[model samples]
Target chain A: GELGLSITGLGVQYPPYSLGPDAIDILSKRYHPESPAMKKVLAINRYTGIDQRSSIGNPDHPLVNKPNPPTVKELHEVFMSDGVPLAVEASRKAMAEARLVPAQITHMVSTTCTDSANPGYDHYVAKELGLSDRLEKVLLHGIGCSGGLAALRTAANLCLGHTARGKPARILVLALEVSTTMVRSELESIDALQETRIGIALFSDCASAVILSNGIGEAPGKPAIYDLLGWENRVIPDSEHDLGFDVDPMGWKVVLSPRVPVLAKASLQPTYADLLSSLQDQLPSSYQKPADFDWAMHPGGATILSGAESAMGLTPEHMRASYDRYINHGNSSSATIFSVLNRLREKDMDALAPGGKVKEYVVGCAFGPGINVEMCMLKRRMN
Target chain B: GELGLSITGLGVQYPPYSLGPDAIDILSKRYHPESPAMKKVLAINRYTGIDQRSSIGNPDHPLVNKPNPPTVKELHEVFMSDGVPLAVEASRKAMAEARLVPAQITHMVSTTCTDSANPGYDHYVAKELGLSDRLEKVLLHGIGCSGGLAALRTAANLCLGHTARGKPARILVLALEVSTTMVRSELESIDALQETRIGIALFSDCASAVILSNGIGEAPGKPAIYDLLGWENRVIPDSEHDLGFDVDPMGWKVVLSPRVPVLAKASLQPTYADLLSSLQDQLPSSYQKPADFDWAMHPGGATILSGAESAMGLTPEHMRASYDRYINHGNSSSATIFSVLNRLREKDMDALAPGGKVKEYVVGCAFGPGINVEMCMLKRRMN
Candidate 1:
């Protein structure tokens, strides 16, 4: 049987601090104590299912004050000083786990919505990791939540291309998003526009990395954690306005319409089915329904999780890993899916199992700005 | 011989207004009539070798005025109104030339430095072109001038990956930039920083597209334009500050240093040699030197072109098409390289031939932010 790209290593880096709901409440109360919307915003935060989320800075950080909002340039400074090191740390961990030195990595693909810079953080990550100077790098921007899988799909293609050319490929895929930094901007939008902006309540900061190999590189005999089987993506028509993360003068802004949960979940089934049908000949006959596979889903929000569950008729246990990660880390944008995948493989699968069985097949899914749905099928290796 | 991804179609669309140097002189004199730097900037514009360049609007447009400079959001509005149509036009032309319907294209890849939006223009392009909703899309941003070849490389990888999975792929690659809109902002940067930003003087507006095929799906026997032979990219070390395109509040800013031409030219040889060496088994022994192939070089500026000529020890005739396009269209950022390639294949090969002989191979190259170099080897089809 033929296999696609193999995921050889996984690593994640959370920021130094984790803030629970109480911390969030204190910060909101300090800033918006007399505001009418404060009560409603706090109520919404309670139901996010997030026990805690990581932050690069504390709630009282200077950037979140209303006296003066930091510009994109200032935010980029924080990304360089704080966000880039996280990427470097995550990348090194993945390389170490793969049992491969930095010199062995041939390609790097990275994605970020929280920061957009020339010579993007990937260049610096490669430089800091002591990776080869000749390493080819690609940085994807303006892709919101689905960026992790997007980068993975991109790395997979690069691997296939190099394999076709009879060359070895060890592609590093990274997703580093610092969404918590936008707290001040989201709060400002809420005050000025007098509208709900739950993004501040839902997002966190995280950096994650994975090494994808085509099995042709100099480093051989690396164990495969999951064999990439098939990939599918589609943009929901006329749904561009349903979800967006736009660049702004002060940091960036997120536009999350109420329709997103329904739109995202409703758009998932056909894409998932398309991916499944494409790999029908390679899988067992029992792998027909969505229930047959364990899921590594992007925890976009509590409602998004519930909508997906109801849409697929999936029980809560089927997406145990996703919910567990959501409870711990919230949505770290593109990095959330990787953290979820890492948790699934590293922890006790017996207790986290769905339907009293640990499924060998795993489905990775994420939704982003285009109301875009990215789905991939993976066969978990027992090794 | 096992051929690689083939360039099956070519198309390009230029904005309606073409502003000559004289028109630029008029606009500069009107705005900076009392400024001392006007003389130097005007002189520099003359040596750019740009006779005329396209614009989404006239030079005297309101956006370039000093009273109030537009923001990135405003620039995006212009892109949607003016830039996206150009992409649609170029895409339609490429699809028609490839003998493919919208539904036949399995993937879409687009790039830009002029505008960064939520959907990144590719989403609207897919919709406006009536492409299938299920088509996979990848939007490349912050890639700067190397974007055209970068996107082509990305599409090639997608083709290879799909072919490996027993799937056919007809991928559409597009590069669109609306740089003329940045004129007002560029002038402001020059005044505020008192720095010579040659970016405004260099860049123009254009969009181009190509169809890359894996010889799969419904598009068959679509005669190959050039079979993709090899792709090479490298980020120059310690050169990040030498070239940059930063996302700014009042539109994006371009950072150009005098070191670019020297750094870009110095870095090309080893990378180019590496590409040629990898393909040595497939090519004729005579295809040894830079002179052996015609060039589709991105006309970044006059010095960059001269530097490449000196570095490779090649005559002007070897890069006739590159010089010709640079003179007529200036630098259209990511779209310029495609225009160069189009001119190479569309014109009479007998006339543009180097060494008084037509070459069956072509080398495509471009330098961008990160001082990143993108190079590709192509075998021309004589059909």
Candidate 2:
């Protein structure tokens, strides 16, 4: 068996509504029972089962003119200032949780899609965390929600190759997204409005860290999460019309179509069957459907969540918690699924009950601009 | 030693102004004793040894408007459809040059900084060229001039790693830049004027491709222009103020300050020295100086070129041809330097001057918004 990575720390921020009195007031004002648009939006949310949400502090409080939301400049400043400080804040927390230090991180992999600065966030992380100068940093952008799992797959390959060559590489993956900066006020059509609403109400800012190492040389006390069995990427052709981010003079505008949900549902049967068949020899018989595995799918939008459930034949309860995170924290782009994973960890779902046959296995999935889908399979490990 | 790779194909597109015509026109229009701004621009060009320059067809051409540049929708209808078909044509030429087929291309690495789409050029390449469905496509963007070399480095690594595992991979790096798309109409300040001038004269629309594979046990008889030794990145802290691209209602506007050249001169010495030192333990002493290498630095602008030459202690003759490329084709971002390399290859400089101690070593460099420098060292391989 191979040793897979373990999640050590996490941080998240959401938009449109926060989790306090102000958020309540805003929600009330924006969506009284009588408002037609509010009714439509709420009906959608109810079906999707998302309840809470967060947003960058809005300044348009009857005192200010058209207030700016978290802009790209603001996000860059927060993430790249004071000794790579924001990344340091998150990386430090992860290292502390793992009972490790910066020196232990031999390979650093940083993933994002929302905002970019050259010498990007990864450079700052290396400088601030005091990691080895020899650290190999991979910066991935534009891949969107699928980036985290893709990055994890990359790290797994790096670790596997390094271990094969007798070098002990501790690989760290950090995913951070601040989708709020690209938000805009004006939308041209219904699709545009839906897309913007999704961007505002669902997408949030967040970061998460996971560490991977060789199991053969590890100490006995520490537990491995799961053996990374396989990974696959499915890029649908001519599906660019379904979803994407369009950059205009105003900012990055979300391009969404109702066809997205339809296409996603249509592709699932074949893609999932193909993925499972490829791993048929490896998959235990008990691993059958969504009910059998703890799933962490990128919370792209409420519609996507509902569509995925229907397509995969997943029970409402299976994705209920993820929907909760979506509502509370919004979709944090690449980092949103990790937040759900953190919740599962908090619930100790990975700990096997008596005679439970390794109670938990996790399948993670995310979609990106190309109508690209990246999937990973994770199983629990015994201590 | 790691196995090296060889380029199998080449392609290029530029503004209507051919190098010869543009050179003549620039000399007459500015220095023919009629223009005053010519004195300043000419002094800068003369100091940098840039005789003439090529620009996008025309700065004020109806097609080239800025703020966001042309919308992806517009580009899709015009350039992308046509450009992608053109790329397929070039890829076919490369196949003839390498005597290879689509199935032989195990990976496709596409590089561009000027224009983009959700599905990107990879899908277009695969569909048009009949490349394998399993072909891994990597897209590199926003890095500007350095993107070409960066893509080359990435392609090389992919080939080496895949080949190491007994999976032979042929990597193709393609860079396409359409600078005219991001042209700004309103030039209000000195900075804007400089940016407009730089954008008009120093940048063109072009694309180029290079093929890379494992040097050992795979391909045969292809001449290697350069052995990629290593890469280095340097970011000048707080220099973001000097250079950037701001998206406004009109399109994507270029932001540049006069201090850019000064900053380049200040940073080059230390960076060059560090790169040279890293190569010392691996290569012989003869490989130390700029005179000993075939220069392939990015023609970012006239002033920056001068600053680089002064800092690196190289004579104008060392980079005369590349400067000609800038003058003739403008700076087509990543494609500009490669066009220089292509010209050198066409002249058969390597084959014509055999047994020379300094065959042809290229140090490729580019600067992006981070006010960051990305560089790579390459040596022409003797058969």
Candidate 3:
């Protein structure tokens, strides 16, 4: 309803473990079969709604050096060498799609929870992209799985505020996670052990970059792919400790309460209801409720998805994209939504009525630590 | 010149080791007198323009658990328990000063490169402040010393962009550094060993928070204190390795090339020139040249300040606030700019003309990894 931004470019990249089968095989062997959690882990892996996930599996990085699993330092080493380049690649791809030069970029927001670097990846991205020396940078850490949406919100804010800045602005938003390398099989604590098992089962390695700008096109004929309509976020209190990423000696560890889906379901009603109401003027009159929009739940897990569907009153068909991505790519953590969005957009774009008309809208949602939920609504520029 | 944002609140909090003399004593005992780096450490520290600083000194946190120093895990425990609240303290103070409620905050940006926890401190700050569950958060890591300016720039950008949202927005910008607990008197490599010595010499624990907004006041009477004028950032390519912090078992470690100050001097010319010229329309005619405005260089070190002064053609007295801050508080990393800005604001405010008039503007600068240079020009509203 307010000044909206445009999606000029969007790009996604997979990690080194290109073969999902290879990754799952490595994961199956990561934990000792005799361990108390092994049976549950293997069973969960088999049923995780994921088929193949490319990532930095143990064989590729083996982040673990001394203790059984991995080291935080070594894992970050993987991020710098293996993870950061993917960011550069996506960013480069976005720039190419935007038909924009580096110097035209005004701001950048980079998000991650797995690994970080000083000057951080933003500096690397800016440098490698030959972005303007004046480019402003934002580096976010520990934003958990919802970080991608946070980056988009930042871009939206910047793009909307462009009329005030006296000059047009373009933002390069990047979300990258080398989550598979964070897999841990040797944590002694039962809580950490269980969480690590889930993290290994659900997480994948990937990077997604987007070009958000005030300009809709390079010339008079160009139109934006999509217009950012609106977004909302909520941090469920009393659930702060329900989910989080911790620093394990071997790498990143997690503390995930089984109540996450329940929490998401409880929070989804008000969050989505309010967001949909706000999108009233932005969307067509027929789009009056959550079910009216094409839903792309974060696909955090099957439970999270099922809970989300029940809460939003969505049909099984509405979740196919998320389900497909989860099955084929697993959860790429912060990068999942991009893959999900890509899948949905492609499907929607290809689907045609008798007249070859495409879907006009989509909504993306994600959950992360702080038990936070971030969601955004988007409108296709053409049908 | 662009939309000038208002800094309605500014607050700072100190860490446990509030005395500098004692810290040196601990460090002197930390490294054997026979070590080659000891003499240089002491010599640089004495000339550091620093007299004392408060941080998580050994006596307060005693971060080390084994042989000579503390372990990374324990030190971070100190951060979670001892460091995070101080950030909360400053942020709360800023909110109070702004007479703003937490629910009113639209966005938040938190900066830190030391001891981090799951959900990190950003979530904690938002939750503790009763900040609207809807508040947007950004967690910046490894941005190094220049991070404070980075956070402020983010605030400025967000505030400037609020015009697009069709409503006002307030941002809570926080920068905190718990330097003392990060102390490491043990390392095998000579390079790390020497860098640790310098880090120990220069860093101090502190947190600075500011409330930035597009709203000038709540009603007809109140007004903002300063209007953000303009800013510039530059990454010195090839010098990316000149400075930054790395994860160590003890905590965050520093990488200081002997060429840091030299790099700052080399880069300050064009960087400052662009910034000054950019400030032309924002600064009143009375505040024309670099010398016309108050300067608060980050005081990353005495050498960096001295080198900057030489290039800017400024007098030693021009850097009194920065030098004084360094002398009294040491470099608080990402929190350092808040301290330096505080000092300059106080001095410039005190130097008001007979009619209680203050200078028209102030300039702030800092250095970090990427050999990055960050500077912001501030136009003082009035005394």
Candidate 4:
């Protein structure tokens, strides 16, 4: 009888091209000296878990042999040429699965941090879907890696706003990270800006879309993906530089502090307790060492993942999909968790404690600059 | 007994620096010839209505007497360093006026198209405001000129979401377009990039903030500034290039098409009428011709303003504050409308229709890329 929203459909897509670490980084050998430092850098690329990346040009991979450091101009060129082709692909698939028609969507929200195109491609996305011009339209940039969930939160809120007005509501939410096409020549030079190499080995590109509605199912038989649940975030103080996308003339470079894992390890417990406090009824009868829920944490990096697992008391099995995604797909940045969720739907659901005296919950979380933590509590509708 | 949202406070801030057009643009003579075309630009700059501006640097002005064209690196450096200081100043001021403490806030949303920072300064703004670590944090980078109203719509929805959960809610919404610091070298050579000069003369920098809550008053005596009536946006197909903030390696450059005024004249009536159909009861029973509202339009330029006035059947007096703002401070993009509202609050407001049944309303509207249009209808509370 209430008007809370539900996640009805989800879809994700990566650019057509993908590359492995070795093929993407052979040139780094010429930049770093034969020291433990270079060894460590290579070691991270080798073992930090990311193995494959899908992007636009796959242009900067060492194997392609870029002629120069790509300009911000060049990165924008791809965003312009690409438009909503990838995002709409994802949105169309999700809409289809949700059985939503273009005219039925009351709101459209998109998030991206890759381009500076004003107006960007939101129009194209809407056009591709044939959405009615009257729907609320929102587009965001600079939300960083946590942007995917941020879009979800906004969509859910919009659904509530519409319901508050006593109207049927549904929102189409989409997010994309174009790191693949954002290659930098700065990464080309190993001599000085070697600091940038760490991110080069990670950061993949992806597009994802979801349909959120307040009990307005597009299809008669579609099952809900996740019920409306609580959401929360924390920005660690004095850590602006810990994890950042720093932009300069050539393009953006990632500024990451090695202390991220330590920060995360310390931050997760209190944050979890605080977020879950609002969902008291959803909690286990006692403080059960992360045993009450399945985890879908953002695989920002190996250490960060380990930090979450340690703080939440989850075994590798609890985060099998996460590590698997990281190892197979690199860090898809804002889109990483979507990839993780898609994987978990196939293999991790059976691992959850069987159906409801209590349903198992999935706690999806991601970390980014601000040393910020964003977590979304999720659960599937019982068939 | 139903919940709704209201804007209780508004605050605006600019960089410490300020300048007039001549002082800011003395060097433009080098970029433009002594011909009639250059003369026309000078004439428009003189009459454009903007009289003052504040920015980190006036890079685009030919008169900037610069050492060299600003590299993309330098522009980003200022964005990184200046970060959220000015933005927070506006937010804090609004929060203070609204009688809210940072910890009382449940959500924080910021909008901008001026930077490419990954994590952005949104965290800094929140930290500066001492916001509770648990609040929903969102940073929007590329909403272009309509970003201010977009943030408002999102904040209103977040408030609804909180109320739906039976929680008392308040959202801090902010928007800043720091055009002063966004100067680029590309706009410097007027030789070929003549298109930039049109924007160079019009765009200024600004920051604004507002507090949206379901309460009618923040304290006992405070009144709701405006009961938000409604919001809607539309994208005219195939007109994405008409007006845009195009980004490249140097920095973002404003893209303008001369046909904008013609397009606006044609699109606004149907758009405005469609918007009004939903506001039917809110209208004057006689259905007077666009006569009951104080139009706080985004004064993008002289022709655009002329187009709005003409299509809406309003006279110069109706757009005095808008033109005054444009002449005094240029367009300032997203922040321009806030400046227009601030000015109208002091003067042109009562100049419309006075008090009660004929209560004056402010119709805030803006146009951006996609040939898109965003409009907000509002009414002030009775004192």
Q: Which one is best on DockQ?
A: 4
TM-score, B chain alone, candidates in order: 0.96, 0.79, 0.90, 0.87
Which residue segments of model 3 deviate by more than 4 Å?
A: A22-33, A57-68, A185-197, A216-218, A348-358, B1-4, B22-33, B58-60, B185-197, B347-358
Q: Best to worst by TM-score, what's the order?
A: 1, 3, 4, 2
| Model 1 Cα RMSD, 1 decimal | 2.3
Highest TM-score scorer: 1
Candidate 3 TM-score, C-alpha based: 0.93
Docking class of 4: medium
TM-score of chain B of 4: 0.87
How far is B374's C-alpha from truth in model 3 (Å)?
1.5
Worst lDDT 10-window in candidate 1 chain A: A25-34
How well does each candidate superpose onto the true structure, as a TM-score? 0.95, 0.79, 0.93, 0.91
Greater-TM-score candidate between 2 and 4? 4
Decoy 2 TM-score against native = 0.79
lDDT of 1: 0.81
Q: What digit string (tens of lDDT, one per residue) describes model 4 on residues A221-268? A: 647777767777777878787777766556676777778778878878
lDDT tens string, model 3, B300-373? 67888778667887665565677777877888888878776666667445543223545567778888887778
Against the true two-chain complex, what DockQ does each candidate achieve?
A: 0.58, 0.25, 0.62, 0.63
How far out, in Å, is residue B268 in model 2?
4.9
The local lDDT score (0 to 100) that residue A364 gets in candidate 2 is 73
**Residue A234, candidate 1: alpha-carbon lDDT:** 75
Q: Which lDDT tens digits does candidate 3 get at residues A1-383?
A: 44647777888888755545634544436344455565566566777777787775444444643346545666667788888888999888877877788878888888888775676767776777778776777877867788888888888777766657556778888888877665453333433444335666777888888888776334465556777878898888888778987764555567788788888888877888878767655567767776666777778688888887788787655666788777777788888776676667675443322134345777788888888788888886653
